[PDB]
Swiss-Prot record:
The keyword Thylakoid does not apply. Belongs to the Rab GDI family. InterPro entries: FAD/NAD-bd_sf, GDP_dissociation_inhibitor, RabGDI. Regulates the GDP/GTP exchange reaction of SEC4 by inhibiting the dissociation of GDP from it, and the subsequent binding of GTP to SEC4. Plays an essential role in the yeast secretory pathway. Extracts GDP-bound YPT7 from vacuolar membranes, antagonizing vacuolar membrane fusion. GO terms for molecular function: GTPase activator activity; Rab GDP-dissociation inhibitor activity. It comes from Saccharomyces cerevisiae (strain ATCC 204508 / S288c). This is Rab GDP-dissociation inhibitor. Signal peptide: none annotated. One of its GO terms (biological process) is small GTPase-mediated signal transduction. Keywords: Cytoplasm, GTPase activation, Protein transport, Transport. It is found in: Cytoplasm. One of its GO terms (cellular component) is cytosol.
Amino acid sequence: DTDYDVIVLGTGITECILSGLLSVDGKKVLHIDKQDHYGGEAASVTLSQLYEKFKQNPISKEERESKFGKDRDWNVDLIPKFLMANGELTNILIHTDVTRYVDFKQVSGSYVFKQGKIYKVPANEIEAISSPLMGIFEKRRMKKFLEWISSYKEDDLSTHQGLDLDKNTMDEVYYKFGLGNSTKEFIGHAMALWTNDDYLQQPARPSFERILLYCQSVARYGKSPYLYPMYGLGELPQGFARLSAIYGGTYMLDTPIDEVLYKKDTGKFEGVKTKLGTFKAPLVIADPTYFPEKCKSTGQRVIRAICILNHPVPNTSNADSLQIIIPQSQLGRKSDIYVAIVSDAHNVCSKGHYLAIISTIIETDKPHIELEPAFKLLGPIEEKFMGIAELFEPREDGSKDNIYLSRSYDASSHFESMTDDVKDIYFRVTGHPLVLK
């Protein structure tokens, strides 16, 4: 075939989901990648590959296999992110049926940083009354707050407790319940998953919904609200490649774009020229690396430090996996710091080893030093693999040229902003919001 409905460029997660969505929608999708492996700018790599990428002089095979074990046990996501169990993305992933290949397993814990230590995020009334995050009266306010979150019904006025989610700000909701500033910090940053404090002066409704989502997601399997695939996120592009074949799709790896074809007068997308031929479609979905002149910097750079440990993270009750959220005001920062922790329980490293991946938006001339507080939380660290990436966004929404571009993957250790981008790109491409039919 030479003519398709959609051409997609890159097999980063955002592209894979969209081409997956379009294929199950009955569209005919040619999906190409210039790279000889899946994952785009967010590939999954073996431990040996990890050394080649980040280390000037990588250690010998014998050192590595004795210290850390064999490559076949290591599936290290470059940008690992967790899935909110009851969130929109889970619904999206199930809709596409990529979940027939990918097995999402519970992350064991959810933690928040306060004044030098990390604590479990209390997601039920029971956890609230036992939490060292709060003083004794605060414990009891938080229990009442979570009782309210769970008992609120839009159509039952008495459950509202004098508050309305449209007219009251979240700060007014907090005031009602008597909640201190530290408490609202972990609610806002670690339950509602806001990245700053702007939500304080905005209607409570969106805050209410995200907190409820958080609590409902924990209650699902019992340990945390977060999911992570067995063998890690590298399973997803592989699963989307399979899913494509079923819908008459072609995932063309190792195929660079020699030239992009444009229509004469209008300047809209026409197709691409490859070593395998010339292929045409009315529209293209691609990542920023395929059209850098049609993308712009956000001004943002992200530092990621992939750390290897021989022991679990201190003060996590030997959790096999967890997220830590470090709220910005705890470090006098403009940006939260994120930590994703996974281990052999998810089959991404060898037995007895842990992966602790730290990420944040850089705000100083010394990015590695911004992460010191996060490094301190991990105990002895065997090796760090640290990189900096600049974040890009499209210059246009693609309505003028039929070139629909994704955003670079940001600092968060969870999938919310990625899901926002998928929904937004889908709307731009199809002219309507995404509905799961």
